[PDB]
């Protein structure tokens, strides 16, 4: 007579978990390097950058969900302190492999067809719903095979599994002091149909591109010993002693 409704996969996986986080600078980028974010960042939307949602979504082989992207923008100041600004941010949704902008004020941000969302810091966080956009009927979470017809393709990375790019910029111009604008993206998968459950991953992750494994140096969660050791098979660790 116990309710089993909390272990539903629609309830199990629909936690709005952190999927992206960049503290990028917000200043005069006339003298900054090429690798640094010049008031914008692209992010290829993947479930794999943070290991807690990843291990939950890697419990299944095939997932059919609607990503409910919630973008939490928060701001800090890089000697003296002044008031935090009410910065307007654009988060333009670019598809996989399409043209992502190269500047803050480039003419790709006009969003003549791309889905953008113009939100502020002092507003509630920008929550959009990105649909099930796989060309297949489910996201191949694990894709045993290769994408390209040649033999140079990446193993495990099906581009149909890839959601897309989330190009996020600050709509405001540069201001005479530098701010550190941290953009946290929270994806809540919903309308979830889950197929083919898998062994939960025990060893720690190495990369987001694959399923490489190293393990800890000692038990628990080591390669030769996943479960932590005890004395003998007839030795009870948490034994009651009275």
């Amino acid at each position: 007579q116990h309710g089993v409704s909390e272990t539903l996969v629609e309830n199990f996986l629909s936690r709005a978990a952190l999927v992206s986080k960049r503290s990028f600078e917000y200043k005069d980028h006339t003298s900054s390097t090429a690798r640094a974010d010049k008031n914008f960042f692209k992010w290829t939307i993947n479930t794999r950058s943070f290991v807690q949602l990843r291990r939950k979504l890697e419990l299944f082989t095939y997932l059919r969900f609607d990503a409910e992207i919630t973008i939490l923008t928060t701001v800090a100041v890089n000697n003296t302190y002044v008031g935090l600004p009410d910065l307007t941010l654009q988060a333009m949704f670019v598809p996989t492999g399409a043209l992502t902008p190269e500047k803050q004020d480039s003419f790709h941000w006009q969003s003549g067809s791309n889905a953008s969302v113009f939100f502020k810091i002092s507003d509630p966080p920008a929550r959009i719903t990105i649909p099930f956009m796989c060309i297949n009927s489910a996201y191949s979470v694990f894709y045993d095979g290769f994408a390209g017809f040649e033999k140079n393709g990446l193993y495990g990375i099906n581009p149909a599994d890839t959601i897309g790019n989330l190009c996020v910029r600050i709509v405001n111009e540069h201001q005479p002091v530098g701010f550190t604008v941290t953009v946290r993206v929270y994806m809540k998968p919903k309308h979830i149909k889950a197929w083919a459950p898998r062994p939960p991953r025990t060893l720690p992750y190495m990369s987001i591109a694959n399923a490489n494994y190293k393990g800890k140096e000692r038990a628990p969660n080591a390669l030769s010993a996943i479960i932590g050791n005890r004395d003998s098979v007839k030795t009870m660790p948490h034994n009651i002693v009275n």
């Binding site: 409704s5 539903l8 629609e10 719903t129 649909p131 099930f132 809540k188």
Partner: peptide, 18 residues
């Protein structure tokens, strides 16, 4: 929760009815 004032069927809440 039955509030879905959007024209898209995927935009609804998480269908936790089972």
């Amino acid at each position: 929760n039955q509030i879905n004032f959007y024209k898209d069927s995927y935009a609804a809440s998480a269908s936790k009815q089972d």
